[PDB]
Amino acid sequence: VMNRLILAMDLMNRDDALRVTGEVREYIDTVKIGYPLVLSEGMDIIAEFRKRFGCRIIADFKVADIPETNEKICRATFKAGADAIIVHGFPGADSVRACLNVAEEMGREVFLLTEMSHPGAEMFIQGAADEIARMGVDLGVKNYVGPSTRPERLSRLREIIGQDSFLISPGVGAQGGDPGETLRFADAIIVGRSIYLADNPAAAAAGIIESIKDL
Amino acid sequence: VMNRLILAMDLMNRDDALRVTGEVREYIDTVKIGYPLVLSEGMDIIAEFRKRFGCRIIADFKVADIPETNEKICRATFKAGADAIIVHGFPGADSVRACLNVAEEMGREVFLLTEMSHPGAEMFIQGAADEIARMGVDLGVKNYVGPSTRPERLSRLREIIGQDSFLISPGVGAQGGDPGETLRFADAIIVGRSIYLADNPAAAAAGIIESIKDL
Ligand SMILES: Nc1cc(=O)[nH]c(=O)n1[C@@H]1O[C@H](COP(=O)(O)O)[C@@H](O)[C@H]1O
Numbered sequence: 084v085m086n087r088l089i090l091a092m093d094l095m096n097r098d099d100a101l102r103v104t105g106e107v108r109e110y111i112d113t114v115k116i117g118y119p120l121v122l123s124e125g126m127d128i129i130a131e132f133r134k135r136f137g138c139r140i141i142a143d144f145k146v147a148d149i150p151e152t153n154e155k156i157c158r159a160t161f162k163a164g165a166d167a168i169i170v171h172g173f174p175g176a177d178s179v180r181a182c183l184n185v186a187e188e189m190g191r192e193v194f195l196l197t198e199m200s201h202p203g204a205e206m207f208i209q210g211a212a213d214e215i216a217r218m219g220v221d222l223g224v225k226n227y228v229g230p231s232t233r234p235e236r237l238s239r240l241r242e243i244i245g246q247d248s249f250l251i252s253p254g255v256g257a258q259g260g261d262p263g264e265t266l267r268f269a270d271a272i273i274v275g276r277s278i279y280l281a282d283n284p285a286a287a288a289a290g291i292i293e294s295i296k297d298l
Numbered sequence: 299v300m301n302r303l304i305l306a307m308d309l310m311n312r313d314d315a316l317r318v319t320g321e322v323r324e325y326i327d328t329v330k331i332g333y334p335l336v337l338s339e340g341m342d343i344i345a346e347f348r349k350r351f352g353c354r355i356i357a358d359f360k361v362a363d364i365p366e367t368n369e370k371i372c373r374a375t376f377k378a379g380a381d382a383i384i385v386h387g388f389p390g391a392d393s394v395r396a397c398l399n400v401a402e403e404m405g406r407e408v409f410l411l412t413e414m415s416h417p418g419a420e421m422f423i424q425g426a427a428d429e430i431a432r433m434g435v436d437l438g439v440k441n442y443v444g445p446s447t448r449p450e451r452l453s454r455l456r457e458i459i460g461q462d463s464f465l466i467s468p469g470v471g472a473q474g475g476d477p478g479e480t481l482r483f484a485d486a487i488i489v490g491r492s493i494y495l496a497d498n499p500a501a502a503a504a505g506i507i508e509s510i511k512d513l
Pocket residue numbers: 091092093117143169196198199200201228229230253254255256257258273274275276277363364367
């Protein structure tokens with residue numbers, strides 16, 4: 084992705100989301116859109132962004148249902164124009180396979196979320212995360228999400244998935260993660276609030292990129 | 299809930315969803331709306347249903363994000379008119395607390411999903427599920443979701459949460475669960491496909507209710 088930086092656009096107002104995304108578009112080629120924006124403004128926002136900005140869109144829906152419902156969610160999301168969807172691995176292999184099947188049908192991609200970035204991830208997810216990652220490898224998953232806030236965990240995840248798999252990582256900035264350290268293991272960093280709540284989002288994005296180029 | 303039966307309305311077309319829900323409305327007072335319908339027709343469908351049918355709406359969004367994003371998702375969902383939201387417990391206590399805080403702010407309810415009904419739930423969720431349930435109790439959660447497909451698990455969940463907590467249970471019908479056995483432990487059953495894909499949804503709902511009354 085452009086500059087190894089993916090914008091997490093979690094503003095809940097179309098006008099604000101469009102403003103900020105336009106201001107930082109010169110510094111990214113990929114926007115992650117999640118439920119805060121989608122549930123406030125509608126799924127039509129995905130195609131609007133994809134057209135206006137000519138970006139890739141990752142739908143951060145953390146799909147976490149039974150196989151049959153997962154299929155439906157994925158199909159609706161790809162129909163709306165998303166390039167990729169983020170899926171939880173904790174519901175197990177059949178749930179993940181359902182998403183992979185729809186992605187294969189529709190020429191899209193699945194990102195498997197393996198270990199989350201927030202403190203509560205330590206309670207249940209972290210102890211399962213290596214196994215979840217190995218399950219991804221065994222299902223043929225090629226795209227993964229793991230936590231900027233725990234680079235030792237992010238290193239272990241990279242170790243499991245290998246150097247060919249694509250790994251993106253949230254938790255940079257607001258949650259305490261560091262761009263450069265995260266990029267030792269991840270291919271791209273996800274950044275939300277540190278950009279979209281900044282007084283000058285373009286300057287915030289530029290500052291991050293300047294530290295990325297230095298690596 | 300009316301007749302201890304909650305409709306899982308996972309049709310993806312507004313016309314079909316309205317038809318079926320209207321046909322079975324005499325047999326329920328509660329409709330569970332999830333992402334298949336919401337992502338296809340918009341969040342405005344929630345208020346439309348609530349008005350047309352005068353039902354309670356549970357938003358089955360299986361909220362599974364970091365605390366900050368969870369807050370946003372819950373707020374958007376309650377703003378749309380949902381009475382309650384289903385939250386995953388696997389992301390840990392801070393993620394659940396974020397949802398509880400918004401529910402307290404907005405006079406709504408959280409349902410904690412503890413153990414899922416599909417086969418893949420055995421891989422990671424089942425081994426954490428008792429702990430997830432105990433975490434719910436310790437957070438003051440009063441409403442829970444557990445699996446019709448494993449009534450021994452559903453009994454253990456009931457044992458942890460006590461007799462005062464409200465427990466609803468999916469996996470009845472299409473996934474193999476039985477109404478009567480499930481209602482030994484759950485207060486209400488969730489039923490989707492066995493009703494909404496039936497040639498006669500009203501007759502399917504009536505048949506289920508007739509077996510519920512017999513208990
Ligand atoms: N996909 C995620 C997985 C995860 O482990 N943590 C995380 O924060 N996210 C999402 O990344 C973004 C983090 O944004 P920020 O902390 O930089 O504002 C938000 O959209 C989260 O909902």
